[PDB]
Amino acid sequence: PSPREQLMESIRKGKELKQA
């Protein structure tokens, strides 16, 4: 998996975002 392949896989995985 290329550095870009692993970027797209992280986007599809999603992530938690911060607070205020």
Place this chain on the structure above:
Amino acid sequence: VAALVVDNGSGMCKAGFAGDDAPRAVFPSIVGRPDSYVGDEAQSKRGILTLKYPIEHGIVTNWDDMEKIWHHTFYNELRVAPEEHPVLLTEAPLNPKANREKMTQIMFETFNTPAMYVAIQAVLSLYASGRTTGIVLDSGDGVSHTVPIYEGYALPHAILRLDLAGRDLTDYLMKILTERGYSFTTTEEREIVRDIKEKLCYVALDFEQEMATAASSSSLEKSYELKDGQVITIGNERFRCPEALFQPSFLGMEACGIHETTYNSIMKCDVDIRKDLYANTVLSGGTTMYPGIADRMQKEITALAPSTMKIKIIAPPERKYSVWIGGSILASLSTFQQMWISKQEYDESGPSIVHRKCF
């Protein structure tokens, strides 16, 4: 340290932190001069100033004012400094190569950004939804774009542009209310009509049927109360306004509606990717916020698409800010960390490194 996400639009700018889930700063894209004000401050002093919009239809047309907006963004708005942080900027689909280079030059040489990146606005909205492949309808204040995206790549040959958005719809609502009785002459009155548009207007599933419903009873009417107490009543104008999105003819335009523009874009792509696009049609931008737009888009594309096809319209509940949020996700990823452009990399190559690094 956290990166910054700056999303500049035709009407509004969105600024904050990569890591956050909402932009901290949201303000008009207005630079005012009679020595120079930006954003909220400038809209008030309009009486003593000439107001300028650096971003026309998503494209930066003035670079001196764009500098002033960006400056106000860090120092005045975010109360931080550009040389401490990496900066994620957003660009319009089919942004001229030179504009991209000038955007890279201004960051590094004028603000001394240690790192920067420029991403396409629609691509970011797709990311915000949790997809990497799909088609995005981005309708803002100045421009509507239909952008088919394959694994992060916006497909330039298949991107379509329509200069019909929120600003045009605000003006259209003014006109049809003027026809019905009311007079909207001042800019403080336009900012009211714009609010009416954002509060009450909706997209009809069947326009002709809805017009018949509005002509037989008052069931579709809503009352908007003014600051002075006076109440105005709106009937079919509620859905006739955003109808112009599907029938540009309402504005005297010879153009396909957002639905057929979306269809036409899918039909310009490779035949083997369409079936994913039809089922991954994401809506973004402030002008896609009308209640019932998702169901209408669904209905209209179903009529144009193969009858066997799965049609799915994704309208993220927050989509008014999906561009910024998509950037706030992207710039926060540990996997993305090496895809920035360092100040070193700029000093070694020049502005034209943007093309080989940002795609």
